[PDB]
Amino acid sequence: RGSFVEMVDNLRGKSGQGYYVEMTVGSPPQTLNILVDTGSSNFAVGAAPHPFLHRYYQRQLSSTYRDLRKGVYVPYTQGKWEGELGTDLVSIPHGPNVTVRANIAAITESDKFFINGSNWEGILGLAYAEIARPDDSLEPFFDSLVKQTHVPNLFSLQLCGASVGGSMIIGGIDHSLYTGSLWYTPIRREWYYEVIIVRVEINGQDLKMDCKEYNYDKSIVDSGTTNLRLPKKVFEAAVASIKAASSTEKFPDGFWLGEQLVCWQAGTTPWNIFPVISLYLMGEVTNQSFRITILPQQYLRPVDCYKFAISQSSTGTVMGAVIMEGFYVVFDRARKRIGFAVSACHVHDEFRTAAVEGPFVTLDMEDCGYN
Template identity: 35%
Template sequence: MTKMLLYVVFLFSFLVTVLCSEDYNLYGDAGQAYAIEVFLGHPAQKLNVLVDTGSTTLAIATYPRQDNNEYFHFDNSTSINDSGKEIQAKYSQGMWLGRLASDYIQFPSLPNLPEVRTDMALITKSHKFFMNGSSWQGLLGLAYLPVGAWGDHLIVESWLDSLDRRLKTPSSFELKLCGVKSSSNATHYGNFRVIDDAVETYETIFRTPILRKRWYEVGVLSMRVMYLKQPNMTSVPASTKNSQENYVSTDLNIEMCQQLNQEKSIVDSGTTNIRLPDDLYRQVVDELKNAVLSSNILILDEFWYHAEAACWTEPQNWSLPWLAIDLLSTESDQEYFTLELPPQNYMRVVSARNNTSENGTVPEFCYKLGLEAGGKETVLGYTAMEGLQVLFNRSAGWIGWQSSNCGPNARITGPYNVTTSIRAACQLNKVISDGAMSIKAAQWTLCIISIIAAAVLIYLLAPCIKMMLMKPLPASNQISLSQAALVQQDST
């Protein structure tokens, strides 16, 4: 009887664990973004591709690389349609050359999604694109069509556009990026899901508008270092309304806002760090560096300015300032909200292992700064997304942010109001691209304009053509009634 009772308790605990636990379908090694498993072709070949909101094209390796012999054997797929036409893409780091093809793709972790045929790039050559030891074989672009791969007179459709056409309804997607499971583990994990806009009901969520539908371009209003008034933040909720009482905050800095959006500000899951304009990057890093010095933590300058790792024999429990990122709200042109990121977001774990030395096995825990200089552009890489759930509503044109049940203790506060137009003050009033307007639509528009111009030209030249084709008639002494009336009126 006792054994039976123990068995029932064990079975119940097991079922509760299975039913209550969440399945994560995104994984990645340190500094390599988040990858998802896909099946390509018929018969299906299992590969891993990065989920990338900073590009559009599904691009797959077709050859072995250094430290990675896995790739797509397209010759083994009976459903491949290889056009043989050359395409290419260039990223902020790296580039590739390849051919345009189409084949079937399926996501084993998303059984509710149908298998669809989609365009893809068969990568034949690359430069600084695949990192050594990377566990992924390609890229799943999730942005809009204008930032897809290009070729001569070619349009490369994205997987999301293919999916929308198959479902006959627009789809959104959500990224829940959890970061590392612990300070002694460098592998990060998360969840990717596709949402049907027609049936999904959204809970309380902070939304920022997509200013231009190429990348996911948003209005980043400021980047601030936030100092704690109280050291214990465990009692602070992850997402609050009008609550910043535990922080010293500053008003919206219009000059900084213009600097952040001078070129573009995008949300990019394919980029690791938060990229800031050079001057602002140095300002933020200097402030963080001074905070570290005042806390008696020894970190060399190479860590802050040259992307070098800092290592310790034990995992670090950081008690450093938080970072605050202000984003324009969709609710009002005079409203914004704030992403508040703890130091666990920007002090990234890049190595957690036992190192063998002459004195035996020595544990080594290494970290890198999750900030970098970006020239004139601003990029919110996945460092700014960990600990949050980020919903990309492509058709409605907004990105939603809410707290997460995994990852760093990141939170969202607001909304906050200002007295002037944020778009005008921060110079965010750029030309907004229609979501339905793609390269193909632009080509059709150009074609229609050409036809109309030709028709107008023919209409204007018609009298001349008619005179050339018709024989001249003898002169006549008759005049029209209108001419006679004018002559008569002049003579009186």
């Protein structure tokens, strides 16, 4: 408990391409790099020589592979894969010292799914069975891990942004990865890692929207998305504040829509003109909340050119890597809650830091949830 030196620094990645962990599948073990995704629930790996892939799962080499005799077709908004379901033995070399029999979707066809130039070749969905495809009887990897072993039912993520890196601590928390205290928000329902945002501030100024707007139709914590996505109305209000707060430089309108980059002469990005953004999350106690604060170092991504990485959503709020890179995030499944603490590795300057602060007094938090 509290100390997991073998798992520290077990994540890698490249700017814009996600954080992946090494895994082994089958017997003998085949090594694969697998993207860590708290926004989905399938363990799915390339299983055919797609040209973008460095490595892929060759089921014919595994004496422990078992076919489920069932296909799966998974369309997303942009992109899709299809695959054949089976189970095999899986382990995590820089992770707990166990092997589990897990479901694996062998991806045999895909479109706009793999990234040309990336170094991963599958995805580990860490969310709940309810959003698993094709349905919720396909048990997700972490559920299998916890049923078949004594690994406790929680994992934590420290994502260190830009070549990126971090730590996925499986079964525990490592205190050297954060400073100050962890603050917890309830998981509102076990499907995505759904949470409730109860107030939004831009440089300390409240957007003063009806808080149900903040969670329209859900808010989730998603390591498989780069941006902070905001419901359209909230995004509109939020941009108007940020634009106002930075109004000393003007940028194309296109910029704020993620449609154009902005560039400054190297080593001169004027961070100080851009405001901090705070989300207050529902706390553990009635009428109690706490607040996480991020910097422009988080929401202006380097591509010295930058992309504005807060964007409009039609799927609710998505607290992607733009939020998570500021914090150490604990997915405390056993107690249905998500903890945040300031990450010991987050990108900051000599004037401002990411922050997690409480308790605050917030009434009518239950009304913030959308039904």
